[PDB]
Design an enzyme around this catalytic site. Sequence first.
Site, PDB file in Angstrom:
ATOM      1  N   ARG A 157       0.858  -1.243  -0.052  1.00 28.48           N
ATOM      2  CA  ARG A 157       0.193  -0.092  -0.094  1.00 28.48           C
ATOM      3  C   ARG A 157       0.871   1.447   0.103  1.00 28.48           C
ATOM      4  O   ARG A 157       2.057   1.054   0.386  1.00 28.48           O
ATOM      5  CB  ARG A 157      -0.990   0.149   1.157  1.00 28.48           C
ATOM      6  CG  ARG A 157      -2.213  -0.633   1.112  1.00 28.48           C
ATOM      7  CD  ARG A 157      -3.187   0.152   2.090  1.00 28.48           C
ATOM      8  NE  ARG A 157      -3.762   1.460   1.545  1.00 28.48           N
ATOM      9  CZ  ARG A 157      -4.392   2.346   2.167  1.00 28.48           C
ATOM     10  NH1 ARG A 157      -4.673   2.113   3.487  1.00 28.48           N
ATOM     11  NH2 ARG A 157      -4.861   3.327   1.673  1.00 28.48           N
ATOM     12  N   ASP A 172      -1.414  -0.186   9.139  1.00 30.87           N
ATOM     13  CA  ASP A 172      -0.561   0.990   9.132  1.00 30.87           C
ATOM     14  C   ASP A 172       0.387   0.851  10.247  1.00 30.87           C
ATOM     15  O   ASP A 172       0.482   0.007  11.071  1.00 30.87           O
ATOM     16  CB  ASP A 172      -1.402   2.295   9.022  1.00 30.87           C
ATOM     17  CG  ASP A 172      -2.389   2.199   8.116  1.00 30.87           C
ATOM     18  OD1 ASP A 172      -2.167   2.460   6.898  1.00 30.87           O
ATOM     19  OD2 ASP A 172      -3.616   2.373   8.211  1.00 30.87           O
ATOM     20  N   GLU A 223      -3.762  14.285   5.286  1.00 33.11           N
ATOM     21  CA  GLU A 223      -2.850  14.365   4.263  1.00 33.11           C
ATOM     22  C   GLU A 223      -3.267  15.431   3.390  1.00 33.11           C
ATOM     23  O   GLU A 223      -4.149  15.389   2.864  1.00 33.11           O
ATOM     24  CB  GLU A 223      -3.017  13.073   3.605  1.00 33.11           C
ATOM     25  CG  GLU A 223      -2.497  11.748   4.304  1.00 33.11           C
ATOM     26  CD  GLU A 223      -3.234  10.589   3.949  1.00 33.11           C
ATOM     27  OE1 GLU A 223      -4.214  10.746   3.261  1.00 33.11           O
ATOM     28  OE2 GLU A 223      -2.332   9.401   4.105  1.00 33.11           O
ATOM     29  N   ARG A 246      -6.904  16.436   2.697  1.00 28.52           N
ATOM     30  CA  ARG A 246      -8.027  15.546   2.961  1.00 28.52           C
ATOM     31  C   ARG A 246      -8.621  16.165   4.107  1.00 28.52           C
ATOM     32  O   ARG A 246      -7.964  16.999   5.055  1.00 28.52           O
ATOM     33  CB  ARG A 246      -7.340  13.995   3.587  1.00 28.52           C
ATOM     34  CG  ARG A 246      -8.313  13.084   3.797  1.00 28.52           C
ATOM     35  CD  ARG A 246      -7.940  12.271   5.016  1.00 28.52           C
ATOM     36  NE  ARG A 246      -6.813  11.199   4.442  1.00 28.52           N
ATOM     37  CZ  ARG A 246      -7.104   9.827   4.832  1.00 28.52           C
ATOM     38  NH1 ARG A 246      -7.853   9.383   5.838  1.00 28.52           N
ATOM     39  NH2 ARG A 246      -6.449   9.093   4.062  1.00 28.52           N
ATOM     40  N   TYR A 268      -5.581   5.507  -2.679  1.00 32.45           N
ATOM     41  CA  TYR A 268      -4.662   6.377  -2.776  1.00 32.45           C
ATOM     42  C   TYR A 268      -4.143   6.605  -4.287  1.00 32.45           C
ATOM     43  O   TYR A 268      -3.956   5.517  -5.042  1.00 32.45           O
ATOM     44  CB  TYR A 268      -3.475   6.497  -1.994  1.00 32.45           C
ATOM     45  CG  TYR A 268      -3.407   6.422  -0.526  1.00 32.45           C
ATOM     46  CD1 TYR A 268      -4.946   6.421   0.142  1.00 32.45           C
ATOM     47  CD2 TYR A 268      -2.600   6.798   0.390  1.00 32.45           C
ATOM     48  CE1 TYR A 268      -5.076   6.873   1.398  1.00 32.45           C
ATOM     49  CE2 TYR A 268      -2.807   7.171   1.926  1.00 32.45           C
ATOM     50  CZ  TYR A 268      -4.109   7.132   2.217  1.00 32.45           C
ATOM     51  OH  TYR A 268      -4.100   7.639   3.748  1.00 32.45           O
TER      52      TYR A 268
HETATM   53  C1  LIG Z   1       0.994   7.162   9.466  1.00 34.12           C
HETATM   54  C2  LIG Z   1      -0.702   6.739   9.055  1.00 34.12           C
HETATM   55  O1  LIG Z   1      -1.221   6.180   9.705  1.00 34.12           O
HETATM   56  N1  LIG Z   1      -0.732   6.686   7.653  1.00 34.12           N
HETATM   57  C3  LIG Z   1      -2.263   6.360   7.409  1.00 34.12           C
HETATM   58  C4  LIG Z   1      -3.236   7.247   7.081  1.00 34.12           C
HETATM   59  C5  LIG Z   1      -3.839   7.949   8.483  1.00 34.12           C
HETATM   60  O2  LIG Z   1      -3.814   7.010   9.590  1.00 34.12           O
HETATM   61  C6  LIG Z   1      -5.115   8.856   8.110  1.00 34.12           C
HETATM   62  O3  LIG Z   1      -4.626   9.835   7.249  1.00 34.12           O
HETATM   63  C7  LIG Z   1      -5.700   9.520   9.298  1.00 34.12           C
HETATM   64  O4  LIG Z   1      -5.062  10.542  10.073  1.00 34.12           O
HETATM   65  O5  LIG Z   1      -4.405   6.652   6.621  1.00 34.12           O
HETATM   66  C8  LIG Z   1      -4.425   5.605   5.696  1.00 34.12           C
HETATM   67  C9  LIG Z   1      -5.661   5.335   4.957  1.00 34.12           C
HETATM   68  O6  LIG Z   1      -5.785   4.708   4.019  1.00 34.12           O
HETATM   69  O7  LIG Z   1      -6.753   6.008   5.327  1.00 34.12           O
HETATM   70  C10 LIG Z   1      -3.248   4.907   5.431  1.00 34.12           C
HETATM   71  C11 LIG Z   1      -1.868   5.691   5.800  1.00 34.12           C
HETATM   72  O8  LIG Z   1      -0.957   4.612   5.807  1.00 34.12           O
END
Ligand SMILES: CC(=O)N[C@H]1[C@H]([C@H](O)[C@H](O)CO)OC(C(=O)O)=C[C@@H]1O
Length: 358
Positions: free
Chosen positions: A22, A46, A214, A230, A324
Site C-alpha cells: 500500500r 498502518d 494528508e 484531505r 490513494y
Molecule cells: C501514518 C499513517 O497512519 N498513515 C495512514 C493514514 C492515517 O492513518 C489517516 O490519514 C488519518 O489520519 O491513513 C491511511 C488510510 O488509508 O486512510 C493510510 C496511511 O498509511
Amino acid sequence: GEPLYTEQDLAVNGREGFPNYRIPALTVTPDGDLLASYDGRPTGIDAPGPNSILQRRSTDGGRTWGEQQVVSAGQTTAPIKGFSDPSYLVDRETGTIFNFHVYSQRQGFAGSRPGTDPADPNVLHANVATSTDGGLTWSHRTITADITPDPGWRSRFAASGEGIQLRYGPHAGRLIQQYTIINAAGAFQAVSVYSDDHGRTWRAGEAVGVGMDENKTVELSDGRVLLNSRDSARSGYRKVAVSTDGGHSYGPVTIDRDLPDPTNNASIIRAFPDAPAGSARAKVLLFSNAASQTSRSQGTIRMSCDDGQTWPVSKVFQPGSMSYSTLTALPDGTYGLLYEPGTGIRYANFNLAWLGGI
Ligand SMILES: CC(=O)N[C@H]1[C@H]([C@H](O)[C@H](O)CO)OC(C(=O)O)=C[C@@H]1O
C-alpha cells in the site's frame, strides 16, 4: 494527438515477499528514470505495523520495471520497527532525491506522545532517506527534532506521494514537503516542512486549519502555494488554503465543492512544471482522487486551466475500487499515475489527449 492510457501492476498482494502492499509515491530522477515507492506490510496494517519502504525502478519510461529493492527495512522481531508512507522529493537544482517516511516503534499516528528523542519508542518519528546517486543507495536521518518547533505537537507524518521544489519568486529552489500534525488540543493540522539549503536543514512553517489530514501543495502561475487537503472532519470535499509566502503561513481554509472526496489521499500537480511565471501553461493543474463521497472508488483526473479556480475537464480512470493515487510529469510529455486498486499498487500512464477537454 492520439489518446493514450495504459496500466500494469507493480506490486500485488501476496507476491514477491509481502502479503500486502500500500501507499504509492512516484517520481522521475534527473537522469529520467522513474521511481515507484510503496509500503511492504507484513501484517497488512498502518504504523506501528513493522512495515518496509520498497522501491522499483524503470529505465525505459515506465514500460519495464526492475526488481523490488528495500529503502528502509522494518523489523518484525522485537524490538519492532516500521517504516511507512513514502513521499519522494527531487531537488532539480542539485539532483538529490529524498524519500520521507514514518519511523515507528510502539506507536502510530494517533498514539504518538510528545517528545523528540530518536530513542523514545513512544513517538512516531519523522525520517528522511537521502540519495545522491539516483536512488541507488540511501543515507537515513531522523529529523523529528528539527521540524517540531512547538513542544505540544505530539505527532506527525509526511503526506505520502511527492513533494515539490519552488521555481518562482524570492524562495525559488525551496523544497517543500507537507505534513499533518496533532497539536496539544488533539486537533489535526496541516504544516509545510521545507528546506532552503537543498536538504541540509529542514524546518516547519506555521500550522493551519483544524480537521486537516494528508495534504499536498503546488506552486501556482504567480508563485502562490496552493494547499489541498484531505478533510478528517469528513465534509465530503477537499479543503484548500493558499500561501503568499516563504516562511510558510497559509490563509483561511475553506471547503472546495468542485472536489468531492470520501476522506482519502489525492494528488495535485502542475501539468507544465517548467512553464514561465504568469504564462497560460503555468496555470494548468492536474488533480487525481476518488470522486465518490461514499466510498474509495470512481478514480478520476480533473484538469484546471486557471490555477485551480475551476475544473472544467474530468475523466474517470478507474470506475471501481481506487484509494490513494499520485501523479508526476514524465519527460516525454505524458503523465505517470501510481494508484491503489485494492490489489496492491498499479502504474498507469496517460496523456492530455486522453482527458478529452483539450
Ligand atoms: C501514518 C499513517 O497512519 N498513515 C495512514 C493514514 C492515517 O492513518 C489517516 O490519514 C488519518 O489520519 O491513513 C491511511 C488510510 O488509508 O486512510 C493510510 C496511511 O498509511
